[PDB]
């Protein structure tokens, strides 16, 4: 309903494309005062001045971060770090967080959808999805969090890169 409408409205302005060979590969996010972009996929960002700037890449954390141009500050995304257990919003159906794990019912994700931000009950971002591992009728999501000041990767066994 209206929650999906507002999610689409914010997504039409925050997430950016990554383009390669006539095919979209990845999604970049504008979180707080930095730009996240998972480093595993490679392509040209579908933007003029976003791709003109200089990035900082880490392969250990499989990501790359950038500083906002001063003329896109207002298009923020209201980062946060509180993670109560329960239900969370996502562009492809609600995720369930329990036992320090992120779960999605069976294959609600497509292969190549790495980079979708997850929003909380108030619309604030919590984690960026990286990969998935399917067991039974569910799939555990390998994502990164922003607990305090360090970024922590959680990855289950047999996770396939998206």
């Amino acid at each position: 309903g209206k929650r999906e409408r507002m999610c689409m409205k914010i997504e039409n302005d925050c997430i950016f494309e990554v383009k390669h060979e006539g095919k979209v590969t990845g999604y970049a996010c504008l979180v707080g005062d930095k730009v996240m972009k998972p480093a595993h996929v490679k392509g040209v960002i579908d933007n003029a001045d976003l791709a003109k700037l200089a990035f900082k890449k880490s392969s250990k954390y499989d990501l790359e971060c950038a500083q906002i141009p001063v003329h896109m500050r207002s298009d923020a995304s209201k980062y946060t770090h509180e993670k109560p257990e329960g239900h969370y919003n996502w562009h492809h159906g609600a995720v369930q967080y329990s036992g320090g794990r992120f779960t999605i019912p069976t294959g609600a994700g497509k292969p190549g959808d790495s980079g979708r931000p997850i929003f909380d009950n108030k619309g604030r971002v919590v984690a960026i999805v990286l990969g998935g591992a399917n067991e039974g009728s569910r799939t555990a999501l390998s994502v990164v969090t922003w607990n305090k000041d360090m970024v922590t990767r959680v990855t289950p066994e047999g996770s396939e890169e998206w």
Binding site: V31, G32, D33, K34, K56, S58, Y61, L63, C65, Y79, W146, K148, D149, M150, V151
Partner: protein, 52 residues
């Protein structure tokens, strides 16, 4: 002349390797704080290493 050239080359390569590995260690230590949204490095760390 061969001995002095070899010794100078060895000293230069040693200091170069040590400086490069130290700066790489600094980059590895200070990398994760730049990735967290918002946040700020501790002033003690920001003094012990030049933190932008």
């Amino acid at each position: 002349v061969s001995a002095v050239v070899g010794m100078s080359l060895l000293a230069l390569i040693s200091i170069f390797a040590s400086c490069y590995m130290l700066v790489a260690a600094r980059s590895k230590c200070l990398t994760p704080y730049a990735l967290t949204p918002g946040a700020a490095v501790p002033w003690t760390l920001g003094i012990l290493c030049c933190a932008p």
